[PDB]
Design a protein around this ligand. Structure first.
Ligand SMILES: Cc1cc2nc3c(=O)[nH]c(=O)nc-3n(C[C@H](O)[C@H](O)[C@H](O)COP(=O)(O)O)c2cc1C
Ligand SMILES: O=Cc1ccccc1/C=N/Nc1nc(-c2ccccc2)cs1
Ligand SMILES: O=C(O)c1cc(=O)[nH]c(=O)[nH]1
Length: 364
Protein backbone atom coordinates (compact mmCIF):
# COMPACT_ATOMS: atom_id res chain seq x y z
CA UNK A 1 0.00 0.00 0.00
CA UNK A 2 2.91 2.33 -0.73
CA UNK A 3 1.51 5.69 -1.85
CA UNK A 4 4.67 6.59 -3.78
CA UNK A 5 4.81 3.13 -5.42
CA UNK A 6 1.22 3.10 -6.71
CA UNK A 7 1.47 6.73 -7.80
CA UNK A 8 4.88 6.43 -9.46
CA UNK A 9 4.89 2.86 -10.81
CA UNK A 10 1.80 0.62 -10.52
CA UNK A 11 -1.00 2.91 -11.76
CA UNK A 12 0.97 4.36 -14.72
CA UNK A 13 1.88 0.83 -15.88
CA UNK A 14 -1.72 -0.41 -15.80
CA UNK A 15 -2.82 2.82 -17.49
CA UNK A 16 -0.22 2.23 -20.20
CA UNK A 17 -1.62 -1.24 -20.89
CA UNK A 18 -5.36 -0.73 -20.66
CA UNK A 19 -7.89 1.70 -22.07
CA UNK A 20 -9.77 3.46 -19.23
CA UNK A 21 -12.95 1.34 -19.37
CA UNK A 22 -11.02 -1.95 -19.27
CA UNK A 23 -8.91 -0.58 -16.42
CA UNK A 24 -12.13 0.37 -14.60
CA UNK A 25 -13.66 -3.10 -15.01
CA UNK A 26 -10.44 -4.71 -13.80
CA UNK A 27 -10.29 -2.38 -10.78
CA UNK A 28 -13.88 -3.24 -9.87
CA UNK A 29 -12.98 -6.95 -10.12
CA UNK A 30 -9.84 -6.65 -7.96
CA UNK A 31 -11.69 -4.55 -5.42
CA UNK A 32 -14.58 -6.99 -5.18
CA UNK A 33 -12.11 -9.84 -4.57
CA UNK A 34 -10.40 -7.96 -1.74
CA UNK A 35 -7.12 -7.94 -3.66
CA UNK A 36 -5.96 -4.70 -2.07
CA UNK A 37 -3.72 -3.92 0.83
CA UNK A 38 -6.10 -3.77 3.79
CA UNK A 39 -5.59 -0.08 4.57
CA UNK A 40 -3.29 0.36 7.58
CA UNK A 41 -4.68 3.79 8.52
CA UNK A 42 -6.74 3.54 11.72
CA UNK A 43 -9.39 6.27 11.73
CA UNK A 44 -8.99 8.86 14.49
CA UNK A 45 -12.04 10.05 16.44
CA UNK A 46 -11.36 13.52 14.97
CA UNK A 47 -12.58 12.19 11.63
CA UNK A 48 -15.94 10.92 12.87
CA UNK A 49 -19.02 12.78 11.63
CA UNK A 50 -22.67 12.38 12.61
CA UNK A 51 -25.08 13.44 9.87
CA UNK A 52 -28.03 12.13 7.77
CA UNK A 53 -29.20 10.02 10.74
CA UNK A 54 -25.92 8.13 10.86
CA UNK A 55 -22.40 7.97 12.25
CA UNK A 56 -19.62 8.07 9.64
CA UNK A 57 -16.30 6.95 11.03
CA UNK A 58 -14.48 9.08 8.47
CA UNK A 59 -15.82 11.70 6.03
CA UNK A 60 -14.22 10.34 2.86
CA UNK A 61 -16.50 8.33 0.57
CA UNK A 62 -16.26 6.77 -2.87
CA UNK A 63 -18.41 8.72 -5.34
CA UNK A 64 -21.07 7.10 -7.51
CA UNK A 65 -19.97 5.71 -10.83
CA UNK A 66 -17.13 3.53 -9.68
CA UNK A 67 -19.24 0.68 -8.37
CA UNK A 68 -22.26 1.25 -10.64
CA UNK A 69 -23.88 -2.13 -9.95
CA UNK A 70 -23.08 -2.80 -6.28
CA UNK A 71 -20.36 -5.41 -6.87
CA UNK A 72 -17.45 -4.16 -4.77
CA UNK A 73 -19.03 -2.61 -1.69
CA UNK A 74 -17.07 -4.59 0.88
CA UNK A 75 -13.74 -4.18 -0.92
CA UNK A 76 -14.36 -0.43 -0.93
CA UNK A 77 -14.74 -0.30 2.86
CA UNK A 78 -11.55 -2.36 3.05
CA UNK A 79 -9.86 0.38 1.02
CA UNK A 80 -10.65 2.77 3.88
CA UNK A 81 -13.69 4.73 2.67
CA UNK A 82 -15.94 5.90 5.49
CA UNK A 83 -19.00 5.36 3.30
CA UNK A 84 -19.80 3.90 -0.10
CA UNK A 85 -22.20 5.11 -2.75
CA UNK A 86 -23.19 2.74 -5.53
CA UNK A 87 -24.93 3.55 -8.79
CA UNK A 88 -26.32 5.19 -10.69
CA UNK A 89 -28.83 2.34 -11.09
CA UNK A 90 -31.66 2.54 -13.64
CA UNK A 91 -35.00 0.68 -13.32
CA UNK A 92 -34.37 -1.62 -16.28
CA UNK A 93 -30.96 -2.90 -17.41
CA UNK A 94 -29.38 -0.80 -20.15
CA UNK A 95 -26.10 -0.84 -22.05
CA UNK A 96 -25.26 2.87 -21.99
CA UNK A 97 -23.48 4.71 -24.82
CA UNK A 98 -21.38 3.15 -27.60
CA UNK A 99 -17.65 2.73 -26.90
CA UNK A 100 -15.25 4.40 -26.49
CA UNK A 101 -16.95 6.37 -23.75
CA UNK A 102 -14.24 7.11 -21.14
CA UNK A 103 -11.09 9.18 -21.75
CA UNK A 104 -8.04 10.08 -19.64
CA UNK A 105 -6.52 13.56 -19.60
CA UNK A 106 -3.26 12.78 -17.74
CA UNK A 107 -1.82 16.27 -18.26
CA UNK A 108 -4.86 17.69 -16.44
CA UNK A 109 -5.33 14.88 -13.91
CA UNK A 110 -8.85 14.72 -15.35
CA UNK A 111 -11.21 12.21 -16.94
CA UNK A 112 -14.02 12.73 -19.42
CA UNK A 113 -16.79 10.12 -19.50
CA UNK A 114 -20.01 9.58 -21.40
CA UNK A 115 -21.08 6.18 -20.07
CA UNK A 116 -24.76 7.08 -20.31
CA UNK A 117 -25.99 5.11 -17.26
CA UNK A 118 -24.86 1.62 -18.18
CA UNK A 119 -26.66 -0.34 -15.48
CA UNK A 120 -27.53 -3.91 -14.53
CA UNK A 121 -30.91 -2.50 -13.45
CA UNK A 122 -32.84 -2.40 -10.17
CA UNK A 123 -33.66 -6.11 -9.94
CA UNK A 124 -30.07 -7.31 -10.26
CA UNK A 125 -28.72 -4.71 -7.81
CA UNK A 126 -31.56 -5.41 -5.37
CA UNK A 127 -30.62 -9.10 -5.22
CA UNK A 128 -26.96 -8.22 -4.86
CA UNK A 129 -27.63 -5.91 -1.91
CA UNK A 130 -30.09 -8.35 -0.33
CA UNK A 131 -27.39 -11.04 -0.23
CA UNK A 132 -25.33 -8.89 2.15
CA UNK A 133 -28.09 -6.82 3.77
CA UNK A 134 -27.39 -7.92 7.34
CA UNK A 135 -23.68 -7.48 6.95
CA UNK A 136 -24.38 -3.91 5.78
CA UNK A 137 -26.63 -3.32 8.79
CA UNK A 138 -23.65 -4.12 11.04
CA UNK A 139 -21.29 -1.99 8.94
CA UNK A 140 -23.73 0.92 9.18
CA UNK A 141 -24.08 0.54 12.94
CA UNK A 142 -20.26 0.48 13.05
CA UNK A 143 -20.14 3.81 11.18
CA UNK A 144 -19.81 2.66 7.56
CA UNK A 145 -23.05 3.68 5.78
CA UNK A 146 -24.18 2.79 2.26
CA UNK A 147 -25.73 5.12 -0.29
CA UNK A 148 -27.59 4.23 -3.44
CA UNK A 149 -27.66 6.59 -6.41
CA UNK A 150 -30.76 6.38 -8.66
CA UNK A 151 -30.87 7.15 -12.38
CA UNK A 152 -33.51 6.89 -15.08
CA UNK A 153 -33.66 4.83 -18.26
CA UNK A 154 -32.85 6.41 -21.61
CA UNK A 155 -36.26 5.60 -23.12
CA UNK A 156 -38.30 6.43 -20.04
CA UNK A 157 -41.26 8.75 -20.63
CA UNK A 158 -42.04 9.55 -16.98
CA UNK A 159 -38.78 10.31 -15.15
CA UNK A 160 -40.56 10.63 -11.82
CA UNK A 161 -41.84 7.05 -12.03
CA UNK A 162 -38.31 5.82 -12.80
CA UNK A 163 -37.06 7.47 -9.62
CA UNK A 164 -40.08 6.33 -7.62
CA UNK A 165 -39.40 2.72 -8.63
CA UNK A 166 -35.83 3.10 -7.44
CA UNK A 167 -37.00 4.40 -4.08
CA UNK A 168 -39.39 1.46 -3.67
CA UNK A 169 -36.91 -1.24 -4.72
CA UNK A 170 -33.57 0.02 -3.35
CA UNK A 171 -34.72 2.49 -0.69
CA UNK A 172 -35.17 -0.31 1.85
CA UNK A 173 -31.51 -1.36 1.32
CA UNK A 174 -29.90 2.08 1.58
CA UNK A 175 -28.88 4.44 4.34
CA UNK A 176 -29.35 7.27 1.87
CA UNK A 177 -30.70 7.57 -1.64
CA UNK A 178 -29.48 10.04 -4.23
CA UNK A 179 -31.75 11.46 -6.87
CA UNK A 180 -29.32 12.00 -9.68
CA UNK A 181 -30.72 14.78 -11.84
CA UNK A 182 -27.28 16.01 -13.01
CA UNK A 183 -25.72 13.47 -15.37
CA UNK A 184 -24.56 15.29 -18.51
CA UNK A 185 -24.93 12.03 -20.48
CA UNK A 186 -28.67 11.39 -20.63
CA UNK A 187 -30.74 13.68 -22.88
CA UNK A 188 -33.06 16.00 -20.96
CA UNK A 189 -32.01 14.76 -17.50
CA UNK A 190 -30.51 18.03 -16.25
CA UNK A 191 -33.71 19.96 -17.06
CA UNK A 192 -35.15 18.08 -14.06
CA UNK A 193 -33.04 20.53 -12.02
CA UNK A 194 -35.49 23.31 -13.01
CA UNK A 195 -37.79 24.57 -10.24
CA UNK A 196 -41.16 23.19 -11.44
CA UNK A 197 -39.89 19.78 -12.60
CA UNK A 198 -37.75 19.41 -9.50
CA UNK A 199 -40.54 20.20 -7.05
CA UNK A 200 -42.90 17.73 -8.68
CA UNK A 201 -40.22 15.06 -9.03
CA UNK A 202 -39.03 15.37 -5.43
CA UNK A 203 -42.53 15.51 -3.98
CA UNK A 204 -43.20 12.12 -5.55
CA UNK A 205 -39.82 10.76 -4.44
CA UNK A 206 -40.36 11.85 -0.83
CA UNK A 207 -43.91 10.49 -0.77
CA UNK A 208 -42.61 7.10 -1.88
CA UNK A 209 -39.80 7.28 0.67
CA UNK A 210 -42.17 8.17 3.49
CA UNK A 211 -44.28 5.13 2.56
CA UNK A 212 -41.41 2.78 3.53
CA UNK A 213 -41.31 1.08 6.92
CA UNK A 214 -39.41 3.07 9.54
CA UNK A 215 -36.26 0.94 9.83
CA UNK A 216 -36.04 0.82 6.00
CA UNK A 217 -36.52 4.54 5.42
CA UNK A 218 -33.44 6.20 3.85
CA UNK A 219 -32.40 9.87 3.82
CA UNK A 220 -32.98 11.46 0.39
CA UNK A 221 -30.34 13.65 -1.29
CA UNK A 222 -30.30 15.45 -4.64
CA UNK A 223 -27.10 15.46 -6.68
CA UNK A 224 -26.60 18.61 -8.70
CA UNK A 225 -24.46 19.84 -11.56
CA UNK A 226 -21.57 22.33 -11.33
CA UNK A 227 -22.93 24.13 -14.42
CA UNK A 228 -26.05 25.70 -12.90
CA UNK A 229 -27.01 29.35 -13.25
CA UNK A 230 -27.42 31.46 -10.13
CA UNK A 231 -31.17 31.29 -10.75
CA UNK A 232 -31.00 27.47 -10.84
CA UNK A 233 -29.12 27.33 -7.56
CA UNK A 234 -31.56 29.71 -5.82
CA UNK A 235 -34.47 27.60 -7.05
CA UNK A 236 -32.93 24.31 -5.92
CA UNK A 237 -32.20 25.78 -2.50
CA UNK A 238 -35.80 26.97 -2.26
CA UNK A 239 -37.28 23.59 -3.25
CA UNK A 240 -34.94 21.70 -0.91
CA UNK A 241 -36.12 23.81 2.02
CA UNK A 242 -39.78 23.76 0.98
CA UNK A 243 -39.86 19.95 0.78
CA UNK A 244 -37.50 18.97 3.59
CA UNK A 245 -34.95 17.23 1.33
CA UNK A 246 -32.31 15.67 3.59
CA UNK A 247 -29.13 16.77 1.79
CA UNK A 248 -27.33 17.70 -1.40
CA UNK A 249 -24.51 16.11 -3.31
CA UNK A 250 -22.38 18.83 -4.90
CA UNK A 251 -21.30 18.21 -7.64
CA UNK A 252 -21.54 15.89 -10.62
CA UNK A 253 -19.14 16.25 -13.59
CA UNK A 254 -18.97 19.43 -15.70
CA UNK A 255 -19.93 19.92 -19.35
CA UNK A 256 -17.70 22.99 -19.32
CA UNK A 257 -14.12 22.80 -20.55
CA UNK A 258 -12.11 25.25 -18.44
CA UNK A 259 -9.47 27.30 -20.22
CA UNK A 260 -6.07 25.65 -19.90
CA UNK A 261 -6.91 21.97 -20.38
CA UNK A 262 -3.92 20.34 -22.08
CA UNK A 263 -5.18 16.80 -22.66
CA UNK A 264 -5.40 15.73 -26.31
CA UNK A 265 -8.91 14.38 -25.56
CA UNK A 266 -10.25 17.63 -24.07
CA UNK A 267 -12.86 18.09 -26.81
CA UNK A 268 -14.51 14.69 -26.31
CA UNK A 269 -18.18 14.93 -25.37
CA UNK A 270 -19.01 14.02 -21.79
CA UNK A 271 -18.65 15.03 -18.19
CA UNK A 272 -15.24 16.21 -17.02
CA UNK A 273 -14.03 15.23 -13.56
CA UNK A 274 -10.84 15.51 -11.55
CA UNK A 275 -8.62 18.48 -10.81
CA UNK A 276 -10.10 20.96 -13.33
CA UNK A 277 -13.47 20.48 -11.59
CA UNK A 278 -12.15 21.02 -8.07
CA UNK A 279 -12.66 24.73 -7.40
CA UNK A 280 -15.83 24.95 -9.48
CA UNK A 281 -17.30 22.26 -7.20
CA UNK A 282 -15.96 23.93 -4.07
CA UNK A 283 -17.57 27.24 -5.06
CA UNK A 284 -20.90 25.49 -5.73
CA UNK A 285 -20.74 23.95 -2.23
CA UNK A 286 -20.04 27.38 -0.76
CA UNK A 287 -23.04 28.86 -2.55
CA UNK A 288 -25.47 26.02 -1.70
CA UNK A 289 -24.44 26.06 1.96
CA UNK A 290 -25.11 29.81 2.17
CA UNK A 291 -28.44 29.51 0.31
CA UNK A 292 -29.59 26.78 2.71
CA UNK A 293 -28.29 28.65 5.76
CA UNK A 294 -25.99 25.81 6.70
CA UNK A 295 -29.01 23.69 7.67
CA UNK A 296 -28.90 21.17 4.81
CA UNK A 297 -26.06 18.58 4.90
CA UNK A 298 -23.83 18.67 1.83
CA UNK A 299 -21.65 15.90 0.46
CA UNK A 300 -18.87 17.65 -1.44
CA UNK A 301 -17.34 16.03 -4.49
CA UNK A 302 -15.21 17.07 -7.46
CA UNK A 303 -11.45 16.94 -7.84
CA UNK A 304 -10.55 15.84 -4.33
CA UNK A 305 -7.07 14.28 -4.22
CA UNK A 306 -5.57 15.49 -0.93
CA UNK A 307 -6.31 16.43 2.65
CA UNK A 308 -6.18 20.09 1.65
CA UNK A 309 -8.78 19.53 -1.11
CA UNK A 310 -11.04 17.73 1.37
CA UNK A 311 -10.67 20.38 4.07
CA UNK A 312 -11.40 23.19 1.61
CA UNK A 313 -14.74 21.59 0.76
CA UNK A 314 -15.52 20.94 4.43
CA UNK A 315 -14.73 24.56 5.37
CA UNK A 316 -16.89 25.68 2.41
CA UNK A 317 -19.78 23.75 3.92
CA UNK A 318 -19.50 20.02 3.18
CA UNK A 319 -20.16 17.59 6.05
CA UNK A 320 -18.71 14.70 4.03
CA UNK A 321 -16.64 14.44 0.85
CA UNK A 322 -16.30 11.89 -1.93
CA UNK A 323 -13.66 11.18 -4.53
CA UNK A 324 -13.42 9.06 -7.66
CA UNK A 325 -11.06 10.42 -10.32
CA UNK A 326 -8.06 10.68 -7.95
CA UNK A 327 -8.32 6.94 -7.37
CA UNK A 328 -7.75 6.36 -11.08
CA UNK A 329 -4.43 8.27 -11.03
CA UNK A 330 -3.08 7.51 -7.53
CA UNK A 331 -4.71 4.16 -6.82
CA UNK A 332 -6.04 2.95 -3.42
CA UNK A 333 -3.31 4.57 -1.30
CA UNK A 334 -4.89 7.96 -2.06
CA UNK A 335 -7.65 7.17 0.46
CA UNK A 336 -5.34 6.90 3.47
CA UNK A 337 -3.33 9.84 2.14
CA UNK A 338 -6.41 12.08 2.09
CA UNK A 339 -7.41 10.99 5.60
CA UNK A 340 -3.95 11.39 7.15
CA UNK A 341 -3.47 14.83 5.55
CA UNK A 342 -6.94 15.91 6.61
CA UNK A 343 -6.26 14.97 10.24
CA UNK A 344 -2.92 16.82 10.24
CA UNK A 345 -4.50 19.95 8.76
CA UNK A 346 -7.42 19.94 11.21
CA UNK A 347 -4.90 19.89 14.06
CA UNK A 348 -2.75 22.60 12.42
CA UNK A 349 -5.77 24.87 12.04
CA UNK A 350 -7.05 24.40 15.58
CA UNK A 351 -10.14 22.29 14.94
CA UNK A 352 -11.10 19.65 17.50
CA UNK A 353 -12.44 17.51 14.67
CA UNK A 354 -14.09 17.47 11.25
CA UNK A 355 -17.42 18.58 12.73
CA UNK A 356 -15.95 21.85 13.99
CA UNK A 357 -14.58 22.67 10.53
CA UNK A 358 -17.85 22.23 8.62
CA UNK A 359 -18.77 25.61 7.16
CA UNK A 360 -15.93 27.37 9.03
CA UNK A 361 -15.24 29.71 6.07
CA UNK A 362 -18.72 31.19 6.47
CA UNK A 363 -18.02 32.17 10.10
CA UNK A 364 -14.87 34.15 9.26
C1 LIG B 1 -16.31 7.38 -15.13
C2 LIG B 1 -17.28 8.10 -14.24
C3 LIG B 1 -18.57 7.59 -14.06
C4 LIG B 1 -19.47 8.27 -13.23
N1 LIG B 1 -20.75 7.79 -13.05
C5 LIG B 1 -21.62 8.45 -12.20
C6 LIG B 1 -22.90 7.96 -11.98
O1 LIG B 1 -23.27 6.92 -12.53
N2 LIG B 1 -23.76 8.64 -11.15
C7 LIG B 1 -23.36 9.80 -10.52
O2 LIG B 1 -24.15 10.40 -9.78
N3 LIG B 1 -22.09 10.30 -10.73
C8 LIG B 1 -21.22 9.63 -11.56
N4 LIG B 1 -19.94 10.12 -11.74
C9 LIG B 1 -19.53 11.40 -11.06
C10 LIG B 1 -18.79 11.22 -9.75
O3 LIG B 1 -19.69 10.61 -8.85
C11 LIG B 1 -18.36 12.59 -9.24
O4 LIG B 1 -19.53 13.36 -9.01
C12 LIG B 1 -17.45 13.31 -10.24
O5 LIG B 1 -16.60 12.40 -10.92
C13 LIG B 1 -16.59 14.36 -9.53
O6 LIG B 1 -15.78 13.73 -8.55
P1 LIG B 1 -14.24 13.37 -8.86
O7 LIG B 1 -13.56 14.58 -9.47
O8 LIG B 1 -13.54 13.01 -7.56
O9 LIG B 1 -14.16 12.21 -9.85
C14 LIG B 1 -19.06 9.44 -12.58
C15 LIG B 1 -17.77 9.94 -12.76
C16 LIG B 1 -16.88 9.27 -13.59
C17 LIG B 1 -15.50 9.83 -13.77
O1 LIG C 1 -7.98 4.28 -15.92
C1 LIG C 1 -8.93 5.06 -15.96
C2 LIG C 1 -10.23 4.87 -15.24
C3 LIG C 1 -11.33 5.59 -15.71
C4 LIG C 1 -12.58 5.48 -15.10
C5 LIG C 1 -12.74 4.65 -13.99
C6 LIG C 1 -11.65 3.94 -13.51
C7 LIG C 1 -10.40 4.04 -14.13
C8 LIG C 1 -9.27 3.27 -13.58
N1 LIG C 1 -9.25 3.03 -12.35
N2 LIG C 1 -8.24 2.37 -11.84
C9 LIG C 1 -8.36 1.94 -10.57
N3 LIG C 1 -7.60 0.96 -10.05
C10 LIG C 1 -7.92 0.70 -8.75
C11 LIG C 1 -7.23 -0.38 -8.02
C12 LIG C 1 -7.95 -1.15 -7.12
C13 LIG C 1 -7.31 -2.19 -6.45
C14 LIG C 1 -5.97 -2.46 -6.70
C15 LIG C 1 -5.26 -1.69 -7.61
C16 LIG C 1 -5.89 -0.65 -8.29
C17 LIG C 1 -8.97 1.47 -8.20
S1 LIG C 1 -9.50 2.56 -9.45
O1 LIG D 1 -23.40 7.33 -16.59
C1 LIG D 1 -22.84 8.42 -16.85
O2 LIG D 1 -22.24 8.55 -17.93
C2 LIG D 1 -22.60 9.37 -15.86
C3 LIG D 1 -23.59 9.70 -14.94
C4 LIG D 1 -23.37 10.76 -14.04
O3 LIG D 1 -24.20 11.04 -13.18
N1 LIG D 1 -22.21 11.53 -14.12
C5 LIG D 1 -21.27 11.24 -15.11
O4 LIG D 1 -20.24 11.90 -15.21
N2 LIG D 1 -21.50 10.21 -16.01
Amino acid sequence: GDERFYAEHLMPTLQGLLDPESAHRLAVRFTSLGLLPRARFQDSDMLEVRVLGHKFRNPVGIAAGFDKHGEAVDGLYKMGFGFVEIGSVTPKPQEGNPRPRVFRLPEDQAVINRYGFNSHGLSVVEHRLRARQQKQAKLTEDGLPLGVNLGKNKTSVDAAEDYAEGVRVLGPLADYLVVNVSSPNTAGLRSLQGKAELRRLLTKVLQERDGLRRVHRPAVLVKIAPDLTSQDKEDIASVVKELGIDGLIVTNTTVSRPAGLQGALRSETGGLSGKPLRDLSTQTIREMYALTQGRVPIIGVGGVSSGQDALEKIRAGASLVQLYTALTFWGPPVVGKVKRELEALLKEQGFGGVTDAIGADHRR
